[PDB]
Amino acid sequence: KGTIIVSGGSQGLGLTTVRCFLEAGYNVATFSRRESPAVTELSERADFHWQALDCTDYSALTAFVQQVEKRFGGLDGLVNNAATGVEGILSTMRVADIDSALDINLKGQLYLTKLVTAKLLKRGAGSVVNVSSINALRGHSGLTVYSATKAAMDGLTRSLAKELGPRGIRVNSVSPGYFSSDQTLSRIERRTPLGRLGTQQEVADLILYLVDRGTFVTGQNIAVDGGFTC
Template sequence: MSTDRKVVIISGGSRGLGQALVQDRLDAGDIVATFSRSSNDFIDRLRKADPEGERFHWEPIEGTDLDGVRTFAMNVVRRYKRIDALVNNAGVGVEGLLTMTSERDIHLALALNLESVIVLTRACLKAMIAARHGSILNISSVNALRGHKGLAVYSATKAALLGFTRSLATEVGPQGITVNAIAPGFFESEMVGHLTDAQRARIIRRTPMRAMCTTQDIVDSARFLLSTRAITGQTLAVDGGFTA
């Protein structure tokens, strides 16, 4: 394996933003490891093109399976001998008034959006600290920065990621590891597919750039934060100015 290639773990890489992040890192020449609940055409295509797993590795793991997530990181280290970057992308949206949200959905959001992130990061850090090099990127949300009705649980988990980002950055910075976060606003994806035309128009009207961001906007921002060594402990809002 060429030492010029970075080994990048991206959680939840089978669809949406995760899929775009995986493809971007592969296009850049990196080795990418990802997991998701199940496979799909995208994952199948990548596995077929690289049957030996030289540059792409995937495992079927439910993000709330903390033992599975921990083992996945260990498997990546055994296979590729190191981890250079981690993108904590996997997450679940929980909508609804708090009084109407089931405890099951609350526990799911906490487990997948927060606990799983902490467990996976902890597992990856061991290899990064040994190498005294690494980049960690947490995908949060503008809902961590701005309150919206019906998103209290989701916002709580994404806001917790920002505190996690800042504190961990001070902890592992001396070991050469950066920790940053991206807070995407509403962007063109299946996550906004349920919005009515009126809701979309209202969001765009409240956005200074008068347009929703694209998945590529977020991918470009991720690429920048994963490449810089001078920025750590920061949150970049990619939202067209929605939180300005």
């Protein structure tokens, strides 16, 4: 088994992904801007660890990665999940919102990836999963900048897979479609072949597979969107 860092695990899909690595046998570390009732999990559910952190900061991520390595002695993988949304046509789009969007959604992820990748190269095995989006594959009006940042990570996946392959590390993307998280709903159900929203547990399941049993699979971008995109 081993240890997995899941970025942005304090709520929503990240949290469901944390709660699924833990049941599966892995130690999990995670981080967010603010603490939620990860407080419960802090007591220990496969020994889990959580920290305040700002993902745009390199030396903070360095400390965090280091701590996670002291606490559990090892790293086996990374799930890049942390992303902030950006609705709005590019013409209404405030120039400063583009900058935050590149920093939160692309730069942090690349910083973390550089950090964890370093630890993965020591061990000589590991897997990375970048959680992306169907917007990175299809294109939706008003998600312009968000689509750029997601498709960027999907570009990183193919290239980084060629790079870390020879050192026994796999890298893949998971592109979730519409799932429930806390009445055009109808347009969605009708365009989805499976005719309903997905469940976080179904996305997390996909991720789990690609970390824990995806031995000859790398460079892939799999959509878990009830067929929405196909």
